[PDB]
Amino acid sequence: LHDDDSCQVIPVLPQVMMILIPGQTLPLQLFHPQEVSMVRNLIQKDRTFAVLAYAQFGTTAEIYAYREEQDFGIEIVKVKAIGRQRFKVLELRTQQQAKVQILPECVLPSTMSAVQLESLNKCQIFPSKPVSYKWWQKYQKRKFHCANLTSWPRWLYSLYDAETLMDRIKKQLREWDENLKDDSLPSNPIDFSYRVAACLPIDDVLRIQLLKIGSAIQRLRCELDIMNKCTSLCCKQCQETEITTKNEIFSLSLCGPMAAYVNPHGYVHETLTVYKACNIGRPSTEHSWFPGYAWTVAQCKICASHIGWKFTATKKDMSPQKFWGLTRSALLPTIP
Amino acid sequence: KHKCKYCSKVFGTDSSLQIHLRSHTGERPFVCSVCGHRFTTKGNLKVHFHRHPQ
Amino acid sequence: SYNYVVTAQKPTAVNGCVTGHFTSAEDLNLLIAKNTRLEIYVVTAEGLRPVKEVGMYGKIAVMELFRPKGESKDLLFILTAKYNACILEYKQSGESIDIITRAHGNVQDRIGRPSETGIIGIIDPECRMIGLRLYDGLFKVIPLDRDNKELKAFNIRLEELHVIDVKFLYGCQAPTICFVYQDPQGRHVKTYEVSLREKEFNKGPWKQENVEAEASMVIAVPEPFGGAIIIGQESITYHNGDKYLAIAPPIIKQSTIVCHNRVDPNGSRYLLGDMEGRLFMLLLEKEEQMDGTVTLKDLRVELLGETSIAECLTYLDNGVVFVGSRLGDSQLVKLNVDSNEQGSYVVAMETFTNLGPIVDMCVVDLERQGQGQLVTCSGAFKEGSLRIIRNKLHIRTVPLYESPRKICYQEVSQCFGVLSSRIEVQDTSGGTTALRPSASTQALSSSVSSSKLFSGEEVEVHNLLIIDQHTFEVLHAHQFLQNEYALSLVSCKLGKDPNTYFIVGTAMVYPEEAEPKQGRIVVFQYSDGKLQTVAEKEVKGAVYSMVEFNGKLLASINSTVRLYEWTTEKELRTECNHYNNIMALYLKTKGDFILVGDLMRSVLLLAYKPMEGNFEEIARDFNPNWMSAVEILDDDNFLGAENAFNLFVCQKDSTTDEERQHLQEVGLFHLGEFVNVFCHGSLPTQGSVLFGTVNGMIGLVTSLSESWYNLLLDMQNRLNKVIKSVGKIEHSFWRSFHTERKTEPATGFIDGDLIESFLDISRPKMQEVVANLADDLIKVVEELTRI
Ligand SMILES: Nc1cccc2c1C(=O)N([C@H]1CCC(=O)NC1=O)C2=O
Ligand SMILES: [Zn+2]
Ligand SMILES: [Zn+2]
Ligand SMILES: [Zn+2]
């Protein structure tokens, strides 16, 4: 990690084209010797490189995986990385070691940290949650009782409390993912926010905004603003033709409803899995990202831009069969 | 160099290149290096490929 | 710009109270903490005799008296929220009363996470050490030897993170702490011994595996019995090694105990106050044993009576118990051996004016005198009251017995419109029975809004009260819809119609709905001795704030800032909306401007163009931090209170589209109070705005020229070179902008309380400060004193 609000210079990979969320995996595939040379020195010194977002902000990444597939007389290096701290660029100079100013995380005490009665301070710790809709009222009443000392009520203060918001987000992620109830979601809100920013099918301009947000409380609200209003996902190159909606979002396996995958040639594709959608080829199985499924290309019916893939296979009564996979980069969320 | 002109695979020598070239051929060889689209002529691939995240 | 803040009314709410022998070894002193104010008394046969009052540079959080061996009298220890520690002695040279500081030091650690149950300060029985629970897992220790003048401390690690309350144990071979803590297994009580040589913990006399789920209080029972008492939700327990006792009194199942006090040093009688003002006596039935030993047979709790919602308690003498309160009036009460006709053993001896919590105010001069009064909302639950302050300060009181939310002044009817919130409970019959008759139920005329437009636990019911400005009587009480919550209220003119109207902004709070999806903006008319339903508009959200924007009703529905138009058909039409990304909670205007803000310091300056007929964003300045209130100084500057207890002042820049759209912050000041509402008015300089806080303090904020600002800022640095402080605390450190992590020196503000302390200083120091810069300064201070 880097000192908060410090200025360091970090190498940048020119092949990367993604906007990196902290706590998100960055698959790679490197052919040219210039990129491969950079990965080597990183594991020796800091193991950190920059992933510029498009050129104002970005995220640093740490190398955590490193394979070597010397095949057909050429060395194909397979590296995975995870995002660290956000930043704002100072000056890039392809010699591209970029001058970088680290952006610190803005943490805030509870809304009642100043209006809490010293007599009621000892009653601020609760017995652990039973694993209900009745319990959460007691949480609001007990922790926000001291809102009567202020001009604002209890229910309003709940919509700025990390724990209150974080549960409502988890409630929706249980519809998308049937296997998302345990320790799969960090307890710390600053990390919980970043984890949903990657897990959300949203275009790039939204992803940059959620990176510029300083407080996780704001980020959590912004992430909930998106999850409640944008029920529709459309095509970005024609806009007014809606492809699929939130109600069909499915999670095929453990890695959530949206996971990063790589094509045989080295191109990252974050494919959201759904059940049906509206608006090229025959079932092929080579390099099938989902074992037991055969991929088929799909495009839009107004602009003919790439939308994603449809996976269909036989086996037996394998669940599911008719399910799609749309790439994030070619999706635009809209408000129905 | 020494790169394939269908699946866009890169090889170190021109020998292993021509060893691979006579393997796609099926009245639709030009495969998109991003979405696996099947094209007939190189003029089709050059357009669609640049209509893709790049 | 540069501003000037001065305290108009000292804080009234009491957050601390302890007995002891501070002034004279034989006198019985009652020390009282009113936030930043320390009141010293002497307990006479009648009541309290004022002795001294001092102001510390820091909100007092921990206050304890202790008498080390070989000391004239008891000494005082005070720890602030800024982690300022000090030892205080009394010194009376004939008639000059002085409070010298024997030792002073700051104990803030660079690292550390403030604990969930706040700061806890405890002192060893034998005055050997001072334990301070500042952060989770860290136990700071100040050793009590008379060579520790700087209070250098050493920390110890605590394997327990979620500790609730901790006391020093009584009657032990070594300084022993006892505390209740929580781990995933449950809630436990554990003890440690404290070694000063090893500077670590040793094994504790005992350890009890389990305790009550919501155990909150730890009381150290003195030498006669020993051990410690643990009070929780419905169980009171006693622990001391092999000795264990537990009781489940049904009389304390209704509420939760939050404050206590020891009556006699024997520990046999204990006072217990809860959250609803109730008073309890905890009795330790000691059994005289056959060989000079004394055991403990049973435990008992009896209902004494009912006081003001108690923050702290303290028995004085002859049944006189001081009841300190943060919501209602501090009380001195007498206890009676005999149960009166009702059942209470308590009769009110005295009352102390407590303005806090001030949740709303409005500047008026009902006498038409051209001077300025102040009618505020005060208290909560039964402690609800209005307090009219004049000019000392004449503080009237109008008990309401329920929570006053909002207030405004109407003049065409010469009355006041007041929003109120009373708490009710579900009965088996199927109603919402009230706890006590209050201003809502005890009114002359009732009015339940029917509307029907949207067709045993606590439930809130909001009401609108009309109160004549002379008798302050309950004229009319309007009951809003079942499950409706009123938010804002204003009295103004609707453009051309001379009819003055009462307008209330409401919501529709349900537990299943986390966001407000409905609401109402209701207009009312009080003239014919009754309230009139002058049409209500159905919106789709909460109506947080409302302002009169020149003949047009400005409303805020969630994020949509929206102008409403009073039509000639006695109804409201939507003119134009300025949609926003943040929740439009705050809303203030200044002619044609609009100042929108949310709970997270998101200042957003709009501008209404009359020819365009719509609002247009002019600037913004987001800086995520908890904002309590915000007001408009003038067309350029803006003022608000944020974070802990600070005050900020942003303004507009002096060529770029991105630089004229970035509001620059210029004023940073740590006021010391939590400001809930600003109000314009008063009771050279320009602009007079007053504010009401939770601790009852009222202060005035005014502007200054650059000449006076540069001069007053020069005086402040010189003033703090002769003026003696209480705990030897630098003033700049106290006024510095303090959050929970950010710590920056103050700038853009001038402390009026420090300026008006030049008149109370002597001549040798009056002329020492003004050197290289006497009557000239007197004239300046005199003029400012009028504010
Ligand atoms: N066989 C080819 C050939 C070229 C490009 C791609 C594939 C291919 O399979 N995928 C994806 C999508 C389909 C899939 O299941 N896995 C992949 O790696 C490509 O982008
Ligand atoms: Zn399209
Ligand atoms: Zn090929
Ligand atoms: Zn393609």
Numbering used by the authors:
A (entry chain A): 72 to 125, 133 to 173, 178 to 213, 220 to 367, 371 to 427
B (entry chain C): 381 to 434
C (entry chain B): 2 to 392, 709 to 772, 783 to 981, 984 to 1012, 1023 to 1112, 1126 to 1139
The publication says:
The design of highly selective low-molecular weight glues (MGs) that cause the degradation of a specific protein and exclude others is an area of significant interest in the drug discovery process. Both globular proteins and C2H2 zinc-finger based transcription factors that contain a beta-turn are known to form complexes in the presence of MGs known as immunomodulatory imide drugs (IMiDs) that bind to CRBN, leading to ubiquitination and proteosome-mediated degradation. MGs can recruit or degrade more than one target; for example, pomalidomide (POM) and CC-220 recruit and degrade transcription factor IKZF1 along with SALL4 and several other targets. SALL4 degradation is linked to developmental abnormalities and avoiding off-target degradation is desireable.
